[PDB]
Design an enzyme around this catalytic site. Structure first.
Site, PDB file in Angstrom:
ATOM      1  N   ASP A 120      -5.549   2.725   5.692  1.00  0.00           N
ATOM      2  CA  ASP A 120      -4.483   3.125   6.597  1.00  0.00           C
ATOM      3  C   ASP A 120      -3.525   4.044   5.837  1.00  0.00           C
ATOM      4  OD1 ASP A 120      -3.470   2.929   9.336  1.00  0.00           O
ATOM      5  OD2 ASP A 120      -1.852   1.638   8.574  1.00  0.00           O
ATOM      6  N   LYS A 122      -2.028   6.917   6.258  1.00  0.00           N
ATOM      7  CA  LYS A 122      -1.420   7.956   7.069  1.00  0.00           C
ATOM      8  C   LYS A 122      -0.084   8.326   6.428  1.00  0.00           C
ATOM      9  CE  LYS A 122       0.038   4.391  10.440  1.00  0.00           C
ATOM     10  NZ  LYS A 122       0.179   4.065  11.880  1.00  0.00           N
ATOM     11  N   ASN A 125       2.899   6.083   6.258  1.00  0.00           N
ATOM     12  CA  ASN A 125       2.858   4.883   5.433  1.00  0.00           C
ATOM     13  C   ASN A 125       3.232   5.211   3.986  1.00  0.00           C
ATOM     14  OD1 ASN A 125       2.136   3.323   7.634  1.00  0.00           O
ATOM     15  ND2 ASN A 125      -0.020   3.138   7.067  1.00  0.00           N
ATOM     16  N   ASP A 142       2.795  -0.792   3.781  1.00  0.00           N
ATOM     17  CA  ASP A 142       2.069  -1.335   4.920  1.00  0.00           C
ATOM     18  C   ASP A 142       0.608  -1.575   4.545  1.00  0.00           C
ATOM     19  OD1 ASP A 142       2.148  -2.101   7.834  1.00  0.00           O
ATOM     20  OD2 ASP A 142       0.670  -0.469   7.964  1.00  0.00           O
ATOM     21  N   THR A 158     -13.911  -6.629  -9.175  1.00  0.00           N
ATOM     22  CA  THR A 158     -13.697  -5.205  -9.375  1.00  0.00           C
ATOM     23  C   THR A 158     -15.016  -4.476  -9.132  1.00  0.00           C
ATOM     24  OG1 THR A 158     -14.132  -5.367 -11.734  1.00  0.00           O
ATOM     25  CG2 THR A 158     -11.835  -5.609 -11.059  1.00  0.00           C
TER      26      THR A 158
END
Length: 288
Positions: A120, A122, A125, A142, A158
């Site tokens: 996310d 964007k 954010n 976020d 990992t």
């Protein structure tokens, strides 16, 4: 547990973010209120608790849960969004752009190396903590749709330790890099690559993304470096598995050699058009 709740900052799915000012010392903070019934913020809190101390990741201050709501109290983002600064009152050139990518790119490289994907990324954010517009004031925020790579038994892993299970990360990582690719494009061009404004339709945008073509010629792109174009092209490659890694991005001449970068102000469209196009692009992506 009781703060001083005031204005609402933003909004989201199953969550609202208001501006609290307490700590029993008139100390201003932000508090995200997630509805415990609607959503479970287990992954988010664990990521913030484990990786919040990173300087370019939003730090977690307090956490509360009465059973009905969760209260993630974080540091307040007074500088607003990234685009709100760079496309308004701040001298922005390929130089400043390179610092912005550098700062965010290292953060993503760190997260990818710990087996964390954001999913996310964007530009709404990414926020400055103060109104300086300085690269080190950047914070990735976020972590709602962020996922830690876990084992079968449920242990954190990992990619270094860790076939198709890992290729999932390779895709999810490649989408984070693609998200940075449109931010790079938008920073350079001053406009979204797959959207011309806020009222573009999912059918329009998704056709453009799938085509794997975008404007690297004409407009601002006529006065932009070849290395700058080389990077966006590789970052926005159609196949997510043939896109650059976060490491390969930071080893790129554009990022490394900042002396050779132009320092001339870049043109941009109206902020709300660009912000509009961008939110519409990610709206189209959420459909598919």
């Amino acid at each position: 547990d009781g703060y001083v709740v005031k204005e609402t900052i933003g909004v989201g799915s199953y969550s609202e973010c208001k501006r609290c000012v307490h700590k029993a010392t008139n100390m201003e903070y932000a508090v995200k209120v997630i509805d415990k019934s609607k959503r479970d913020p287990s992954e988010e809190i664990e990521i913030l608790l484990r990786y919040g101390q990173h300087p370019n990741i939003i730090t977690l201050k307090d956490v509360y849960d009465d059973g009905k709501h969760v209260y993630l109290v974080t540091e307040l983002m007074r500088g607003g969004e990234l685009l709100d600064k760079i496309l308004r009152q701040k001298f922005f050139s390929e130089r400043e752009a390179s610092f912005v990518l550098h700062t965010i790119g290292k953060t993503v490289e760190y997260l990818h190396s710990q087996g964390v994907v954001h999913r996310d990324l964007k530009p709404s954010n990414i926020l400055y903590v103060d109104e300086s517009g300085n690269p080190e004031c950047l914070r990735i925020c976020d972590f709602g749709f962020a996922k830690q790579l876990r084992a079968e038994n449920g242990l954190l892993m990992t990619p270094c330790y860790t076939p198709e299970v890992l290729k999932r990360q390779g895709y999810d990582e490649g989408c984070d890099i693609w998200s940075l690719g449109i931010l790079l494009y938008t920073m350079l061009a001053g406009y979204t690559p797959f959207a011309n404004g806020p009222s573009d339709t999912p059918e329009e945008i998704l056709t453009r993304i799938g085509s794997g073509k975008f404007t690297l010629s004409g407009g601002n792109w006529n006065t932009v470096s070849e290395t700058a174009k080389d990077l966006v092209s590789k970052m926005l490659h159609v196949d997510p598995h043939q896109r650059l890694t976060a490491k390969q991005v930071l080893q790129h001449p554009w990022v490394t050699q900042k002396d050779k970068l132009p320092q001339s102000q870049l043109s941009h469209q109206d902020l709300q058009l660009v912000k509009g196009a961008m939110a519409a692009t990610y709206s189209a992506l959420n459909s598919s």
